[PDB]
Amino acid sequence: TTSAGESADPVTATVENYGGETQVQRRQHTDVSFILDRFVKVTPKDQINVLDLMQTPAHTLVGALLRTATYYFADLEVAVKHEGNLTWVPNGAPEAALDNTTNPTAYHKAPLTRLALPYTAPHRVLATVYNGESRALPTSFNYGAIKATRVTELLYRMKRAETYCPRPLLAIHPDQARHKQKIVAP
Amino acid sequence: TTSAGESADPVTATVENYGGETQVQRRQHTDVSFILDRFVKVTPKDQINVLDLMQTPAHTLVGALLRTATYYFADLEVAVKHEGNLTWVPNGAPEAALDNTTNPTAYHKAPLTRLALPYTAPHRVLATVYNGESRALPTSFNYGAIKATRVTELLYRMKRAETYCPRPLLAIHPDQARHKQKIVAP
Amino acid sequence: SGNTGSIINNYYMQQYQNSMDTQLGDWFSKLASSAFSGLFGALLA
Amino acid sequence: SGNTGSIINNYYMQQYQNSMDTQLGDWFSKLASSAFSGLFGALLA
Amino acid sequence: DRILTTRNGHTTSTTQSSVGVTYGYATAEDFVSGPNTSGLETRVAQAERFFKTHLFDWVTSDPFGRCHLLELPTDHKGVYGYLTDSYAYMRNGWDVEVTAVGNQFNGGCLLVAMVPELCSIQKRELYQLTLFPHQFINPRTNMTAHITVPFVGVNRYDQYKVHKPWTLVVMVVAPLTVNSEGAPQIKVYANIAPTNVHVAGEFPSKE
Amino acid sequence: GIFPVACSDGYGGLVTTDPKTADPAYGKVFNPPRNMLPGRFTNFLDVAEACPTFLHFEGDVPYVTTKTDSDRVLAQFDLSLAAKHMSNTFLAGLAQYYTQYSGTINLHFMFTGPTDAKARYMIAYAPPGMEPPKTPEAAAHCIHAEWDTGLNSKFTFSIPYLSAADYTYTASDVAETTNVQGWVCLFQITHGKADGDALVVLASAGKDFELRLPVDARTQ
Amino acid sequence: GIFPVACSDGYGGLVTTDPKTADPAYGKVFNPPRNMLPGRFTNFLDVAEACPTFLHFEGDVPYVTTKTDSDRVLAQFDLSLAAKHMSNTFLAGLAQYYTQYSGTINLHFMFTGPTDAKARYMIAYAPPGMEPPKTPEAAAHCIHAEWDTGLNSKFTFSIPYLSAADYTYTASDVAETTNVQGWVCLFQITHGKADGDALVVLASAGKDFELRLPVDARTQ
């Protein structure tokens, strides 16, 4: 389809332009609320872990796909394998309130304890990047902090996820003619 | 019943032809969806196992009875006794994606972890034999791969099974007048 | 329906349980039911 | 609705499960559906 | 009461000793309009005619199970085999017709079978070749066997350079028993024909 | 409080044939379409009833040869699905994975001789209890049937299912060597110039043949 | 008594993608309002279909330069979403997290030459099975399309999805080096005083492009 090449309005020259027809296309596996609510591993510290979603790595699935959005809203539920007792603390409380047990602790039940946390940020929508102080994110961009005796592996997933204002997403650079990796085979 | 001996249309000379009558016959135990959805043992490797159904043995029940079909469609659910964590991977992902935990792991819950997998093949119907490269099956004929620290015994069963285009089924060859084996008795 | 034996409804809906089939737009039961029987010639009692 | 697969109702009500949203008083689906197609000039067969 | 003369396209095949045509696995064709081809398929009506081939010489010294396996499609040096080197994806049925002309004084019989995906067989497996689309030939009754099958396959369109779905199989069930008045050696021929081919995807020219 | 249950004992172990379905882990999968795809079978008996498969005789052959002597016994094989003659049949292929059956077993008899060779045959069912008959005179008193070779060259005889019990074992007993389910005998009565000519036989599932109780006794 | 249950075995382990939601611990939270906030996308394909993104050529550039010699091949790249040319595209950014796809891939071709330079081009799709064409004479027998540079300076050609199977793998095989999904070739046929002038290309998701089966194969 010949177009106006610079107006940057969307054009889709479909396959009917040279004969043929299009089929019914289903897009459930690329939905933004379906692709983001599954568990991802992050590396923990020993005791205190702020529950920021931008400490998910950039090589994983829903860490590199969360950074597709500029602004995101999602309720977090965590799943942490620990020993001792794990106290969750809401957004913006003093970090001395991690030791107190009136805050929502979870007693140790083998092997791990998963629990659903609300969106406790003051902002209407969180963000993945912010040019305010030249890390380089405010202290308000967190779901709170969890503190145990020694956390071993704590996992994030983010549900009811709404995303806004897309950002570029990068696949790794081939040095060959095409990036050929060893696919699974019998 | 005298017939045309070479037309190869079905003829059933019933027992009424020399007096008598036929009874009501029930065929639930020979249904193809009933006889195939039960657990069968396959031998595992140490860590990585592609979930091909043609690695079931040829002496077992639903391995020798799956090879009755040329083309089959069936959803697989596995049951694996392992230690560590067992990550399932869909069809055609790179085998380096077995280590990542965003893929559907199952944490170790004693003694074994059974989980239902969908038909992830690209083809409309899988097959049990294929003359494409002269093992001798494409890399697309699998339900994916599972990877643990050390799998001990992993079991297949195949449900909603549809079969097409039957193949010959062989019973073992007697050397006597009749194959007499030791049947169970008090 | 298979080898199920539960009268209760399933917990997971239909699409988190199986793979959904898609229509586009059997044989040997029709082959075994068209079988010739009786005789071929004039029978007696 | 998400990645849920349960036909039963939830046990905890709605406000001990999620954070309730508040109204006050989408885009790229409208952007991708206003895409121009066909041709630009007089076509032939 | 008999209509016993088939034709495909502009070629006919009259036999007077037809016991009947056996439709294997289907009486009608599948939906040719798939979603894996985006509607860029087209029927080539000029591929539907017979083409003859030689199979073997059934002699009196052949025991049980002298089988012959030719993979369809074979080397077609006409219109149909031009489509194999000019189009990437194509599908078709087949309607085979083997002839074993002796006379009505020979004996024995040979089974004919169209079987999908056939490789690595045993002679102990030959006892159950009846499961496939089959039709017996004995010289006491008939001379031909006329089998018709649709396109089977793992997926809707096929790459015939890397895959051969069907396999015409003739094996000898009873040996050829000549007599004082029979025919010594019979030769098995076959004329095969495609049905409703559909190609999709033009190769670039070799120049 | 919470809803009290009792975690009952003895229940909940992993059984390999149970109707419990496993919990899903990965949803929203839409298969490629498969509708009206050719060659589908639903039950394994319909393949066994619509497609007859050959038998096994002495010399690894499916055909039986006419006999030009005073002895007129073409074949005499015991009636079981674990027999020696029934071994390469598809009907005894899937009856190796069950325990017991009932119903008729069709036997198909195609004559492959020339147009000048004529013969007639008989097939009788000798129920268990005494020795099977060795002459067509003695086997006239069974539930028999005769046919001669003419224009239609195929004969189908449905073996009756006679038994005390309602179901009979498809596995012949290992120690018990009398084969107390039955014999089936087929003879020739005469033949005209049919020397060296064959009679290829076949077997199929009957109209009311149905199997029962699947096991896995390792494919002999 | 109490209601007896059977604590079933094999079920209840922690699966990372399950539709089980975790029990809450801290209720009565009312979020700040977010309604009618600008720039929301719902599915990742709508971003990939409404926003085309550049390709990658030799020299880390998105544009391809006209060729003033006898050879007329501007670009010839294999058709996969793990290709070298498709690597910096957003369409192959999210197709790095799936296993298999189907559908058309739009290619957008904007000519950035001056008003006196004129040229015409062609783009052909060579399906797999033999060597890709090296001349526009040989590539006339593909599913091709031509366009010349005039007032509207942009051309969009939708790559057809031809395959045996219904879905094709978005990851090119590690060992298998033939790339049996297909090639796409774009040539120049002629040019008038278009030396040193560019043709910037783009790629977008098609009208019926849809991905399938998400995995996490670590971001190359």
Numbering used by the authors:
A (entry chain 1), B (entry chain 1): 1 to 134, 157 to 208
C (entry chain 4), D (entry chain 4): 15 to 39, 66 to 85
E (entry chain 2): 12 to 218
F (entry chain 3), G (entry chain 3): 1 to 220
Which sentences from the paper describe this structure?
FMDV, a small non-enveloped RNA virus (genus Aphthovirus, family Picornaviridae), exists as seven antigenically distinct serotypes and many variants and sub-types. Structures of several serotypes determined at near atomic resolution have revealed a capsid composed of 60 copies each of four structural proteins (VP1 to VP4). A prominent feature of this otherwise rather smooth capsid is an exposed flexible loop (∼30 residues) on VP1, termed the GH loop. This loop and the RGD motif embedded within it (residues 145–147 in the O serotype) comprise a major site of neutralization by the host humoral immune response and mediate FMDV binding integrin89101112.
Initially for both viruses 2 mM Mg2+ was included in the incubation mixture. Subsequently, for O1M only, we tested the effect of 2 mM Mn2+. For all experiments, the micrographs clearly showed bound integrin and no evidence of capsid dissociation. Conventional single particle analysis assuming icosahedral symmetry, yielded density maps for the complexes with the virus capsids at 3.1 Å resolution for PanAsia (13,438 particles) and 3.5 Å for O1M (1,649 particles). In both cases the integrin density was visible but very blurred. Unusually, in O1M a serine is present at 134 of VP1, although the loop is nonetheless disordered on the native virus particle.
